[PDB]
Amino acid sequence: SLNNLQNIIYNPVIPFVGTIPDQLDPGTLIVIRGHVPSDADRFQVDLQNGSSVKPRADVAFHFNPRFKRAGCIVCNTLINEKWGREEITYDTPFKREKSFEIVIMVLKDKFQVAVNGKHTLLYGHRIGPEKIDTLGIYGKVNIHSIGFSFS
Ligand SMILES: CC(=O)N[C@H]1[C@H]([C@H](O)[C@H](O)CO)O[C@@](O[C@H]2[C@@H](O)[C@@H](CO)O[C@@H](O[C@H]3[C@H](O)[C@@H](O)[C@H](O)O[C@@H]3CO)[C@@H]2O)(C(=O)O)C[C@@H]1O
Numbered sequence: 001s002l003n004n005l006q007n008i009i010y011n012p013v014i015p016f017v018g019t020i021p022d023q024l025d026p027g028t029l030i031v032i033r034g035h036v037p038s039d040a041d042r043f044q045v046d047l048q049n050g051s052s053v054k055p056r057a058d059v060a061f062h063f064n065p066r067f068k069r070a071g072c073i074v075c076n077t078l079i080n081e082k083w084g085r086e087e088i089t090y091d092t093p094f095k096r097e098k099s100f101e102i103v104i105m106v107l108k109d110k111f112q113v114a115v116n117g118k119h120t121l122l123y124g125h126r127i128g129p130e131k132i133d134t135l136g137i138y139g140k141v142n143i144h145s146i147g148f149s150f151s
């Protein structure tokens with residue numbers, strides 16, 4: 001059959017703020033397929049505790065490809081409206097005008113992210129993943145599909 005992921009969302013409007021339909025237990029996958037527009041400066045995928053804007057929802061995991069200069073991916077955590085220490089990954093596979101697949105795997109102590117079938121980065125948990133119930137996608141990105149595999 002054609003359904004290999006759960007709770008699939010197709011061609012969402014960006015910015016996208018959606019409820020994650022089950023718990024992010026170890027082994028859970030979040031799978032996002034899309035493409036970067038030619039003028040992209042950045043986009044972000046945020047795993048959030050709720051969707052409030054005041055106070056702004058905590059972001060357990062901010063995954064933020066940036067396209068200026070040589071490009072990079074910045075990761076961070078937002079707690080009580082304050083950003084923490086950035087973790088920057090310089091070996092970035094994202095490119096303007098190219099399509100991508102992001103697979104975020106939740107593990108016990110960290111997230112692991114693979115892009116286009118290749119391991120890209122790790123990010124240690126700073127907020128318990130049990131607090132995450134919302135997926136936010138913002139910025140200059142086109143999203144084809146979002147799906148989940150819940151453990
Ligand atoms: C309306 C708007 O522009 N919202 C932005 C916000 C605001 O600009 C910002 O929160 C106001 O302080 O920024 C968002 O991106 C931030 C996020 O990617 C973090 C991750 O660490 O980096 C912030 O920039 C850093 C920069 O990377 C550092 O080099 C610098 O020393 O500090 C900067 C500020 O901390 C980004 O602004 C956000 O999600 O908060 C994107 C929104 O669209």
Ligand SMILES: [Cl-]
Binds near residue numbers: 107109
């Ligand atoms: Cl782990």
